[PDB]
Amino acid sequence: EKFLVIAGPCAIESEELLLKVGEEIKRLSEKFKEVEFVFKSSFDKANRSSIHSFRGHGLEYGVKALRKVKEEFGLKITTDIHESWQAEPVAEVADIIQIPAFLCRQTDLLLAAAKTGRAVNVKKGQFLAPWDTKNVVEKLKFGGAKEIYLTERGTTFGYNNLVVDFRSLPIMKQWAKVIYDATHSVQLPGGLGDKSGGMREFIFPLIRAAVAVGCDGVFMETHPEPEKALSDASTQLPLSQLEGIIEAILEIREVASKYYETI
Amino acid sequence: KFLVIAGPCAIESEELLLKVGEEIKRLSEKFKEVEFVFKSSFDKANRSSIHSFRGHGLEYGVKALRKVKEEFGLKITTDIHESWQAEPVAEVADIIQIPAFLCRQTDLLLAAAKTGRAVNVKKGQFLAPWDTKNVVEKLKFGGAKEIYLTERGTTFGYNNLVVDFRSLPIMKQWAKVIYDATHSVQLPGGMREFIFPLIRAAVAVGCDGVFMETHPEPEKALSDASTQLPLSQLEGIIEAILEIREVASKYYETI
Amino acid sequence: EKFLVIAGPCAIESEELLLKVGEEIKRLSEKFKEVEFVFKSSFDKANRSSIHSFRGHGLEYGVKALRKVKEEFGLKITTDIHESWQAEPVAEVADIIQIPAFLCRQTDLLLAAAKTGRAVNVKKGQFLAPWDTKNVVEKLKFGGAKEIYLTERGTTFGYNNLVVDFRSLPIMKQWAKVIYDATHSVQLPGGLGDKSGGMREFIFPLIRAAVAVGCDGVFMETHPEPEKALSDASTQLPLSQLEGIIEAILEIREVASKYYETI
Amino acid sequence: KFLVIAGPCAIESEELLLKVGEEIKRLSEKFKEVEFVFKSSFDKANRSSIHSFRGHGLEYGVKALRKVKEEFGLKITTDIHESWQAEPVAEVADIIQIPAFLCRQTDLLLAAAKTGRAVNVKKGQFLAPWDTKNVVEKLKFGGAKEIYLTERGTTFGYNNLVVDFRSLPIMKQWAKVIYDATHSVQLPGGMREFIFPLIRAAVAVGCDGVFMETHPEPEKALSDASTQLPLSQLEGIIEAILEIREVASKYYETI
Ligand SMILES: O=P(O)(O)OC[C@@H](O)[C@@H](O)[C@H](O)CO
Ligand SMILES: O=P(O)(O)OC[C@@H](O)[C@@H](O)[C@H](O)CO
Ligand SMILES: O=P(O)(O)OC[C@@H](O)[C@@H](O)[C@H](O)CO
Numbered sequence A, C: 001e002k003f004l005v006i007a008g009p010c011a012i013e014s015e016e017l018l019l020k021v022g023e024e025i026k027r028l029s030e031k032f033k034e035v036e037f038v039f040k041s042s043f044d045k046a047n048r049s050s051i052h053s054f055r056g057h058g059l060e061y062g063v064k065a066l067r068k069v070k071e072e073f074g075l076k077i078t079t080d081i082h083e084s085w086q087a088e089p090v091a092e093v094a095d096i097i098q099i100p101a102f103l104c105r106q107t108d109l110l111l112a113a114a115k116t117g118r119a120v121n122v123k124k125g126q127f128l129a130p131w132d133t134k135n136v137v138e139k140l141k142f143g144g145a146k147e148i149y150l151t152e153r154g155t156t157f158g159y160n161n162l163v164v165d166f167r168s169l170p171i172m173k174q175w176a177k178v179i180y181d182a183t184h185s186v187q188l189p190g191g192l193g194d195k196s197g198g199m200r201e202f203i204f205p206l207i208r209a210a211v212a213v214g215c216d217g218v219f220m221e222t223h224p225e226p227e228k229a230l231s232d233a234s235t236q237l238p239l240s241q242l243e244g245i246i247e248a249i250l251e252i253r254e255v256a257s258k259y260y261e262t263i
Numbered sequence B, D: 001k002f003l004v005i006a007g008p009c010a011i012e013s014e015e016l017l018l019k020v021g022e023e024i025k026r027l028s029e030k031f032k033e034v035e036f037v038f039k040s041s042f043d044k045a046n047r048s049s050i051h052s053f054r055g056h057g058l059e060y061g062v063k064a065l066r067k068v069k070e071e072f073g074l075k076i077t078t079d080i081h082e083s084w085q086a087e088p089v090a091e092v093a094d095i096i097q098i099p100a101f102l103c104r105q106t107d108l109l110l111a112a113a114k115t116g117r118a119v120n121v122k123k124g125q126f127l128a129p130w131d132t133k134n135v136v137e138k139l140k141f142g143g144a145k146e147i148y149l150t151e152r153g154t155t156f157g158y159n160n161l162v163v164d165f166r167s168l169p170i171m172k173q174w175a176k177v178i179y180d181a182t183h184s185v186q187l188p189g190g191m192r193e194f195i196f197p198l199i200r201a202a203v204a205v206g207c208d209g210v211f212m213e214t215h216p217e218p219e220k221a222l223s224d225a226s227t228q229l230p231l232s233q234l235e236g237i238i239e240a241i242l243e244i245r246e247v248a249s250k251y252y253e254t255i
C-alpha cells in the first residue's frame, strides 16, 4: 500500500513560509512516487502553554494560505480543528481533518469532522492507552468517516516527558491506519516553562523504529530554519534534512516489510 | 471558608437534581463553616463510547440548575466544552468548570474568564503541577478573579491515575486548590474504597476545598457509576474532613 | 495499637553521631509513651549510585555502634542487610531486619532474615505494585517470620522521580503492618547525577497524608546537620524538627483514627 | 560483530540445554557474521512466588553450562545474585550477567569485574538511561574491560514495562548496548506478539546485540513461559534482524 508522509511547518507563520515548504515537498513527491504526500500546517495553535505564545493569523487566512499551496503545487492538505464549527470551512480545503491529541475524546469535534466526508486523522491523546482508540474509531465510523487514521505521538511518562510505546502501532492497526508523529513524540511537554522542550537528536532513530515495527505513514513538522520557528522550534526538522530522512525510512520499510505481522 | 462542591455527575433529570439538592441544602444548614456549591454536567461531551449517556442538552440543563439555585438558594457550577457555551451557562453558574482534557484550550479559558464568573480548571491528567501556573495566567489575562485548580489525578501507566499530593502545595502558589475525590480514583477507560482514604489525605495535606460526585443510587447512575458517592454517606465524610482539617490546619505550610 | 516510629541517621557515619541521635530519640520515647521507637542506621550503603560515594565503616563496626545505642539508651534497633550471610550477625543486635527496596524480591535474603526469629521490614520496591507485596509476605511467612512490615517508599514515576500512591497503604494492610517512609519518598533517584536528589519541603505534608489515610508507623531519617550528611543530605530531617513532626502525626492520627477502614 | 545471546531462561536440565545448544550451534555455523553466546540461569533467585521453580543449584548449573561449552564450543553467560558466586561462575561464563534489580549492588558489580570476565548489566526497571553511566564506572573501577548494558524495559505504571528506545543511543555513549527482546514485553507480576516487532525496532535504532530466551516448548517452560521464543522461530528472527541491520546501519548516529 502507498506510504503516507504528512509534513509541513508546524504553524502557518505566513503564506510565504508555506509556499517555500510546499515547493520542496512538491519536489520530493515527484521523486518519491511511491509516497503519498500531504502538506500540513495549523491555522491556529489553540493550546499553547503560554498566553504570550504565537497562535496564528486566524482561520480565514490559514485556509486561504493552504488553498494556495494546494492550488500552486497540487498537494493534498491537512490541518487541525479545535471546535466543531471549524470542520465545515476547513473541509473546503483539507483532504484530511486532524484532531488534536488533547481533544481525541471530544465527541462533537470528532462527529463534526466525520460528516464532512473528508478523511480524519486523530492524534492519540497522551493520556490514552492504545486499546482505547478502538472507541475513538467507532465514534468516527458512527459519524460517517470512511478513511480514518490514528497518530502515535507519545504517552505521558512522569512529568514533562513522553515515551513512545511501539506496541501501540500493531494494536491500533487493528482498527485503523496508523501514522507515527516523528516530531511531537520527542517534545518535552512544558519543559521550558512558558513553552515545551524537545530533543531533536532522537527524531531520526525513533522514526527508524516506527517503520521497522510497521506503520502506514509518518508525520513530520519541517521548517526552513527551525531555530526561528514561532512554535516547536526545538522539534521541527530542518527542511534540508527531509529528503534524506524519507529515503531512509523507505529503505528500512522495504527491508522490514516482509516481516510485518498480519493484523 | 472551606469549599465543598458536590452533586450528581450528570443531569439525568431535574428531578434527580432536586433530590440531591435537598440533601445538599440540609448539609448547607448544618455546616455553616462550609461554602457548598451544587455541581452537575448538562453534557458528558467526552465519554469513551458513542453509545454512552451524554445528557439532555444545555438548555434543559441550565433550566434544571436554575431550579436548584432558586428552590434551595445554592451556588452553582457546571462544565463547558466549547467557547460559545460560556455566556449562556454563566447565567446560572457561579463557577464555570473547565474539563481536564480541555485545561489547555486557550479560547475556552478566555470565554470562561470573560463572563466575569469564577473559574475552576480541572488539571489535565497530562499536566505537571508547575505547568498550571500558565493556566492561571491565561485566566487572569482574560479577566478572571476567582480562580481554582482541581487535582484529579495524573496518568500513571495505562488506565490508571495516581494522585501526587505534592501538587496541592505547588498549585497553591498561584490559585486556590480543590481536590476531586471521586475522579482521582477512576480507572480511565475506579475503586470507591479509596475515595474516603484519599480525601482524608487531601485535607491532612491542605487544600481549599473538595469536589465529590454524589448520587442517591450510584449503582444506577448513567455516568461514573463505579465512583459516585452514595448520598447518605456525604454527611459523614464532610464531618470527617472538617475534623481532620481543624487539627491539621495548624501545620499547613505558608504560601 | 502502638504506633511505630523508626528513625535515625541514614548511615553510621560514626558511633558518635549515633549516640547523639540516640540521645534525642531516647528523650522523645520518654515523652511519647504511646509510641514504640526503633533506632535506625545502615552499617553500609551498598547501592549508592556512584562508586565514589560514602558506604560505611563495615558490618563489624556498625553492629558494635548499634549495640552501644541499644545498651546505652535501651532502644530497639533496626538496620538493613544486603546479602544472606549478614542476617545472622545482624540479628544479634537488630530487633527488626530491614530489606532494601531493590532487594525485596531476592528470595534468599528474605529467607535469611526470616529464620533469625527477628521481625522483618521490607521496603517496597519502586518497581512493585502494592498488590504484589502479598507474595513478599508469603515468602517471609514461609521462612518463619512472625512479625512483618511493608514500607511504602514511593514508586517509579518517569525518570528520576518517585510518586507516592497512597492507595498502597490500605492495600498492603491486607497482608502486613504498613510503614510510611517519609524521607525516601521525596528523593529524586539519581537526580544530581553522581547522587540522588530530594525535596525536603514535601516531607511533612506527605507524612500528614500518610497518617490521615492510616498506617502502623512512620520511617524518618534524621541527622543533627543534614547538610553535612554523607548520604541523603537532601532528604534527612533536621534532628531538632523531629519532636514537632511526631507530635503532629500523633494528633492527626488520633482525629483521623475513627475513620480508618477495617481491612 | 553483532552479538546474539540466546538460550533457555532457566537450566531446567542439562538435557534441555543440550537440545537448545545444538540449534544455537547450527545457527552459529550458519551466521558467521554473528557472535553467539549461550545463556541460561542456574537459579531464578527473584521469582514472585516462593512456590515457583528456582533451579537445581549453582554446581549442577555450572556443570551443564560446561557441557554446552565443551560439546558445542559456544561462549557462555549466566547471571549471579550474590558476590560469592562470581568466582565459581567465572570458571565457565565468558560473560557474567547482573540481574536488573541488582544493577546497583556495588559489591556484586565489583565481584563480577574482579573475575576478569566480560560483564553484562541488565538496566533496572527503575533506572534512567543516563543513570547507567555510574554503573559502567563502577565496573571500570573494578577492572572490567568488556562492559555491556542491556535494555529490558522501564516501569510504566503497575505490572507493565515500556521500552524507551531513546535509551539505546544514550547508553551507547559509555558501553555496548544489548536489547533484551523477551523480558522487555513481560508484564511484571507478557505478550509474545510484540517480541519480533520490538526487536526490529531495536536494530533499526541501533544496538550491538540482542538477547532472546528460547525454549523448544515455551508452553512447558518452568520460567517465563509466556515470553520465551519457540526454538524453531529463532533462525527466522535472526535472519530478519541481520537484514534490517544491514540496511539501517547506514544511518546509525556516531557516538
Ligand atoms: O510550546 P508549547 O506552547 O507548549 O506548545 C506545544 C506545541 O509543541 C504544540 O505543537 C503541541 O503539540 C500542541 O498541543
Ligand atoms: O469513559 P467514560 O466511562 O465514558 O467516562 C466518562 C468519565 O471519565 C467522565 O464522566 C468524567 O467526569 C470526564 O472525563
Ligand atoms: O545518593 P545515592 O547515591 O543515589 O543513594 C541513594 C540513597 O538515597 C539511599 O539511601 C537509597 O534509598 C538506597 O537505595
Ligand SMILES: O=P(O)(O)OC[C@@H](O)[C@@H](O)[C@H](O)CO
Pocket: D009, D044, D046, D047, D048, D049, D052, D183, D186, D188, D189, D223, D224
Ligand atoms: O514473576 P515471575 O513469574 O516469578 O517472573 C520471574 C521473571 O521475571 C524472571 O525469570 C526474570 O528473568 C527475572 O526477573
Ligand SMILES: [Zn+2]
Pocket: A010, A011, A221, A231, A232
Ligand atoms: Zn507542532
Ligand SMILES: [Zn+2]
Pocket: B009, B010, B213, B223, B224
Ligand atoms: Zn463525573
Ligand SMILES: [Zn+2]
Pocket: C010, C011, C221, C231, C232
Ligand atoms: Zn537513607
Ligand SMILES: [Zn+2]
Pocket: D009, D010, D213, D223, D224
Ligand atoms: Zn528469563
